[PDB]
Paper text:
Among the best characterized of the CYP152 family peroxygenases is the industrially relevant OleTJE (CYP152L1), first isolated from Jeotgalicoccus sp. ATCC 8456 in 2011 by Schirmer and co-workers. OleTJE acts primarily as a H2O2-dependent fatty acid decarboxylase to form terminal alkenes but also hydroxylates a proportion of these substrates to generate α- and β-hydroxylated fatty acids. Crystal structure data show that the active sites of OleTJE and P450 BSβ are very similar, with the carboxylate group of fatty acid substrates being coordinated by a conserved arginine residue (Arg245 in OleTJE, Arg242 in P450 BSβ, and Arg241 in P450 SPα). In this study, we explore further the structure and mechanism of OleTJE by mutating the key active site residues His85, Phe79, and Arg245 and by analyzing their effects on the catalytic properties of this biotechnologically important alkene-producing enzyme.
The importance of Phe79 in its interactions with His85 and in regulating active site structure and catalytic activity were explored by characterization of F79A, F79W, and F79Y variants. Crystals were obtained for both the H85Q and F79A mutant P450s in complex with arachidic acid substrate, as well as for the WT OleTJE in conditions containing formate. Structures for these mutant enzymes were determined to 1.44 Å (WT/formate), 1.80 Å (H85Q/arachidic acid) and 1.95 Å (F79A/arachidic acid). Arachidic acid substrate is bound similarly in both the H85Q and F79A mutants as was previously reported for the WT OleTJE. In contrast, for both OleTJE H85Q/F79A mutant structures, a sixth ligand water molecule is clearly visible. UV-visible substrate binding data for the H85Q/F79A mutants indicate much smaller HS shifts than observed for WT OleTJE, consistent with retention of the aqua-ligated LS state in the major fraction of the mutant P450s in the crystal structures. The F79A OleTJE mutant exhibited decreased activity compared with the WT and H85Q enzymes for all fatty acids tested. The alkenes are the major products with F79A OleTJE and all substrates, with the 3-hydroxylated fatty acid formed in excess over 2-hydroxyated fatty acids for the C10-C18 substrates. Mutations to OleTJE Phe79 also diminish substrate-dependent heme HS conversion and weaken affinity for shorter chain (C10:0-C16:0) fatty acid substrates. This translates into much lower product formation for the F79Y/W mutants from these substrates, although F79A OleTJE is less severely affected, with between 36 and 85% overall product formation compared with that of WT OleTJE for C10:0-C20:0 substrates. Crystal structure data for the H85Q and F79A mutants reveal only minor alterations to OleTJE active site structure, suggesting that quite subtle changes in the positions of active site amino acids, water molecule(s), and the substrate carboxylate region may be sufficient to trigger catalysis when H2O2 binds to initiate compound 0 formation.
Numbering used by the authors: -1 to 422
Write the structure that this text describes.
Amino acid sequence: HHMATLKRDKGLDNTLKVLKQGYLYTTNQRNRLNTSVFQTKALGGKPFVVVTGKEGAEMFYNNDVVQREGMLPKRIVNTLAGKGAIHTVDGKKHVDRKALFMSLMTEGNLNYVRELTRTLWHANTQRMESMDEVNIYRESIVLLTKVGTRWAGVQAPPEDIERIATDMDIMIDSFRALGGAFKGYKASKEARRRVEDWLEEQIIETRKGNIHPPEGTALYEFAHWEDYLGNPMDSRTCAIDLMNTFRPLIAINRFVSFGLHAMNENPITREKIKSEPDYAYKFAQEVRRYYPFVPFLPGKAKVDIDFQGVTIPAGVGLALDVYGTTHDESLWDDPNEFRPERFETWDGSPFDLIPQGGGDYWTNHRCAGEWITVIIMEETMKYFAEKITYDVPEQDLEVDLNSIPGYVKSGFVIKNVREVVDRT
Ligand code: HEM
Ligand SMILES: CCCCCCCCCCCCCCCCCCCC(=O)O
């Protein structure tokens, strides 16, 4: 019957086309097919209906019609999320375990991550002054490894931090093939196993009473948690989900690199981060909206869904267009311009600013760490804008929108770092 016909990016499998157009694939198809919703096949002939905008996001997060079970590509589960991770469960089991993740996001725990971040950048100033150049992508990922492990209650000796950061970096990057085979797949599984082994030891030692992580940290709460049926997570699964509490915190290094990129590109933002109290928040929010990170999210239609003039058939894949929604003309005035001032009148909808998911924290798969992400970016941008001066030598600053994942090609390099001190 009874709806209009669902247009298609025709082909048995368009994975290579998706990979070559990257974050602009869905926009290109919508413009080429002149439509707001279309079907494409990928990952070996699997049909996906691409939905976007607020309506797309509110439908994608309707648990009565959309299923997330088994839709993350297996290789991404094996490298990025981990087997049996929170991302891979649905229903009461998911709601129960998600409440554990959300219980970490207290006012005091959020204030703690803010202070850790501020202290570590302040302490890092001398080191960056001594370096001839500083790759911000790499320097922030090492610093955030120190922040994240400590916030999670996980003991990481300083001699192991560079190793851990590198292993996290590999796992975070491992969605690049969208679940297809790729050269660094085994290196990614090996990195994950090293980190999993390390965390599982900490959980076991916590449960044995050999170490005593502080109450309220991820290590403590996860090791002692029981699900709604009375059963604790087995040690390996516990280690996996414990990693889910701070690996993505370490992934904030992507947004730190982007934030300095934005500051360099919009020079006046530096002064306003210094002088306007709310501005650091708005700049952080506009970095998350504007720069590419998560391209889209996979789901599956549980039943026929009537959506934007078409019928989405039961059993077809669904792809929530993350990049397309955060750059949706009709949601954001001049969406391809960096404009932190737009967040002066953003009404806080759960369904437009979705760079880390949409919907409800407690009953949807929406990112648990959005507050931490904003807090860490606020403090990091405040540091770079206010506590130090530096030079940006010319280098490859391109963010290739046709290449997933989004990166500044150089990683954003700075030189001539010097503390700002009033010694008068
Ligand atoms: C650094 C940038 C970050 C990005 C781009 C990001 C993005 C995402 C996305 C797209 C999802 C999936 C949403 C869905 O499936 O509907 C997700 C889930 C999740 N994120 Fe993040 N996130 C980030 C930071 C964080 C941080 C800092 C934490 C923890 C402190 C975190 C913890 C999680 C968890 C636990 C989930 C799974 C929740 C569930 O399945 O119910 N993330 N994130
Ligand atoms: C056109 C649609 C094609 C459909 C293919 C669906 C393939 C799904 C790819 C999903 C990519 C997930 C990216 C998640 C990034 C996670 C944020 C980093 C934080 C972390 O370490 O967890």
